[PDB]
Write a protein that binds this DNA or RNA. Structure first.
Ligand SMILES: [Mg+2]
Length: 757
RNA sequence: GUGCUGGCCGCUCUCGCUAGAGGGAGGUCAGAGCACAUAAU
């Protein structure tokens, strides 16, 4: 229970023979990574033609046999034990030091380094080599796995709709339009009704009239989107290069040195500078950073003890904000890293490991993530916890819930195999959206509409047609130096740019106070990128935007962890939503996990199916109000109820977390969760299902491949689910008076959603 | 210590011109509070 972290200090001065040491290490690394990589049969794409060609692993094997000759097997074992790593690889730096697998191949190939007489030099050299090769092997395997899975996804999805949409795409490319989901959807929609005046889309609807496209018009809204997704996925699959790039080798790599026999370095912190004193290669003077504020270090037999605390960098001299100092941080240091960035400045890195209680992480690992917690875990659970849940959305960024649970305690809630609980802080919204979230949607809408206008401009002028009155009227509202159909596109690009730039300045002056207000600016900027990118292709028929996204993810992860500081576990829905695709589906969860892990708090990911449609109290199905997304409607006991969508989602996430997500929402006619559900709710798991009454399902110890839904303690068929959602819909269409039900009320006897016991 | 900000000013490239709009280096003047696990992709 030591969490790894790192940060950098800038190196001001140097003494002794330091630069010679660094240059020799980097040159030997560059020379020998090449040889030890081409020892590995790795496929790669040539960088000299943007990956147009490549080298197959069979060609790589032939070249390897050409180079090594009679020493293939020994190098195979050496490189295998290098990639595996660990203690066996910790005493095998013999590849360069003149004084065990790497020892004998030197006598067979005669490889030597710049300083074969310096044990530390060779130690760091092979450490850098092994780290650089390991950073690439993992990426290579995950790349091949992803390409295979992404191909097999297309190989399993074939239908007449897919081929017909492929033909439609080829026809559109011949007409120079390019196929998108919006055009496909709206053209299918408008093909059914004959047109009167020219429309924002005309070529597509005109070309959809012919009988060859009769298959599209008779297809189901579910199959059409599936065919479109398959077509786009196949396009990317045929655009992606075969193999990963072989790593760039002229660039410099970070050099690790520590106290464990790799070398000698002593850290002593004084009033003005930090000093690192290598015994023979000189000493380095480093300035103080606000990250390691009030830094103190003390020697220990095989470690260092750092005692620092974060501060605020007020680079402004006449700062107007009161300086604040974060809490003390007790960290352990084992190694340091030295590197030269391309700008020409050295940096010193301090990888420090934190100490925290392992109990919370063990609790969130084996108990709340398993349907079978073995008996020693229950006997090892405490008698008290505070838990929380969060629902992440573009609007109402975080909707948190706090609850207190414990064995031997009574409350409305229920925790599987543990006991009951009650709410501490009622379901609510952590922070309402700022005033500028509304104005940062119109901009993105304008950008995307401009993209579509350019897309139809290409085809219309290729065909010698006349632009529809809608686009011409839409682009005429903005001042332009002329009236041509091409001038009024850039005369609108020049307005979107100014609006986005004014937002960028004004929100940066404040340090990006609101969060859901900056997540909208990120969408606006992402859409503007693709507007400009498509702009410079009309004939051909940055890291400052990927850093704002990183900052926004870190701010979101900090906003979450600040609220649940006193909690022990937090529940999040398994996001493999308009916000998860904006930041990332894989890194936003990683950043949230890191932020919570910083404070010794666990995190548990629960199934996301149906957590926004059930009734938390009664467990019945509800119909989400399409007109107003923030309200969800139910129908219990001849009365219609209304509830807050975000609070319903948070409570359902909490209920699924407290139930380990073992109660399903839908299943075909299984897995561990549904097996345990059938074992507990009903007699056994290996049981057939038979329909009875009118939409109800009786479990008899028939139907196959059907939707069976859990609602109120009984399974229903797909038709009866649609009937219920219809019942409710109709009830709200005749204005029936609903009731307002609050989840934080203390008069609730129980919560039954996702509760099968 | 690292990251994220526009305004203006010449130069230099890519498409169009009933017309300009975007890209890359550099100069200069203002802004500047709140996050950090670093390397790569
Ligand atoms: Mg939700």
């Amino acid at each position: 229970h030591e969490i790894p972290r790192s940060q950098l200090l800038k190196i001001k001065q140097y003494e002794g023979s330091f630069v010679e040491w660094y240059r020799d290490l980097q040159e030997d690394r560059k020379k020998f990574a090449s040889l030890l990589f081409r020892w590995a049969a790795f496929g790669y794409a040539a960088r000299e033609d943007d990956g147009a060609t490549y080298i197959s692993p069979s060609q790589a094997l032939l070249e390897r046999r050409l180079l090594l000759g009679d020493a293939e097997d020994v190098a195979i074992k050496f490189l295998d034990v290098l990639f595996k790593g660990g203690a066996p690889s910790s005493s095998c730096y013999s590849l360069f030091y003149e004084d065990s697998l790497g020892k004998q191949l030197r006598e067979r190939l005669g490889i030597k380094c710049r300083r074969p007489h310096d044990a530390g030099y060779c130690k760091i050299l092979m450490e850098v080599v092994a780290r650089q090769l390991r950073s690439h092997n993992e990426t290579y395997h995950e790349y091949l796995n992803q390409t295979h899975e992404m191909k097999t996804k297309v190989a399993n999805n074939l239908t007449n709709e897919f081929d017909l949409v492929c033909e439609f795409a080829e026809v559109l490319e011949e007409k120079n339009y390019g196929l998108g989901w919006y055009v496909l959807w709206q053209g299918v929609k408008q093909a059914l009704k004959e047109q009167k005046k020219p429309t924002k889309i005309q070529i597509a609807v005109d070309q959809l009239r012919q009988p060859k496209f009769a298959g599209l018009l008779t297809a189901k809204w579910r199959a059409l989107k599936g065919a479109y997704d398959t077509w786009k996925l196949k396009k990317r699959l045929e655009k992606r290069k075969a193999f990963p790039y072989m790593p760039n080798w002229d660039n410099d790599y970070q050099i690790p040195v520590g106290l464990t026999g790799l070398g000698v370095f002593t850290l002593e912190v004084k009033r003005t500078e930090v000093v690192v004193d290598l015994k023979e290669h000189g000493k380095l003077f480093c300035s103080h950073s606000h990250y390691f504020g009030d830094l103190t270090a003390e020697k220990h037999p095989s470690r260092y003890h750092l005692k620092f605390r974060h501060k605020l960098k007020l680079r402004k001299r006449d700062s107007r904000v009161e300086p604040t100092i974060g809490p003390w941080i007790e960290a352990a240091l084992r190694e340091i890293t030295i590197q030269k960035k391309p700008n020409g400045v050295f940096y010193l890195g301090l990888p420090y490991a934190l100490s925290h209680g392992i109990d919370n992480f063990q609790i969130a690992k084996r108990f709340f993530s398993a349907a079978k917690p073995d008996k020693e875990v229950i006997n090892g659970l405490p008698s008290e916890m505070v838990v929380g849940a969060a629902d992440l959305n573009l609007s109402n960024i975080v909707a948190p819930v706090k609850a207190r649970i414990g064995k031997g305690l009574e409350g409305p809630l229920h925790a599987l195999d543990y006991g009951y609980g009650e709410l501490i802080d009622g379901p609510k919204i952590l922070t309402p959206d700022g005033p500028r979230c509304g104005e940062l949607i119109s901009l993105k809408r304008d950008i995307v509409e401009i993209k579509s206008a350019i897309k139809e401009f290409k085809a219309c002028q290729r065909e010698g047609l006349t632009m529809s009155e809608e686009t011409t009227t839409w682009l005429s509202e903005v001042e332009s130096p002329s009236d041509s159909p091409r001038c009024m596109i850039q005369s609108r690009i020049a307005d979107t740019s100014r609006r986005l730039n004014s937002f960028k300045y004004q929100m940066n002056k404040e340090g990006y106070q609101d969060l859901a207000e900056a997540l909208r600016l990120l969408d606006a900027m992402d859409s503007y990128n693709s507007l400009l990118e498509s702009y410079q292709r009309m004939h051909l028929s940055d890291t400052k935007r990927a850093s704002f996204r990183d900052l926004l993810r870190r701010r979101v992860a900090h906003t979450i962890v600040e609220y649940f500081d006193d909690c022990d576990i937090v529940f999040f829905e398994d996001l493999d939503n308009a916000l998860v695709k904006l930041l990332s589906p894989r890194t936003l969860l990683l950043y949230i996990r890191q932020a919570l892990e910083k404070r010794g708090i666990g995190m548990v990911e629960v199934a996301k199916d149906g957590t926004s449609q059930n009734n938390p109290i009664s467990g019945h199905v509800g119909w989400r109000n399409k007109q107003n997304k923030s309200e969800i409607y139910f129908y219990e006991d001849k009365e219609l109820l209304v509830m807050d969508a975000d609070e319903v989602g948070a409570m359902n996430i909490l209920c699924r977390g407290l139930n380990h997500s073992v109660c399903p929402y839908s299943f075909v006619t299984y897995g561990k969760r549904v097996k345990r559900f059938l074992k507990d709710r009903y007699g056994s798991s290996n049981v057939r299902f038979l329909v009875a009454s009118m939409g109800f399902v009786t479990v008899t110890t028939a139907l196959v491949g059907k939707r069976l839904y859990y609602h109120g303690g009984e399974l229903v068929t797909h038709d009866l689910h649609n009937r219920m959602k219809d019942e409710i819909k109709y009830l709200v269409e005749k204005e029936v008076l609903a009731r307002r039900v609050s989840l934080s009320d203390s008069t609730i006897k129980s919560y039954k959603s996702f509760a099968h016991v």
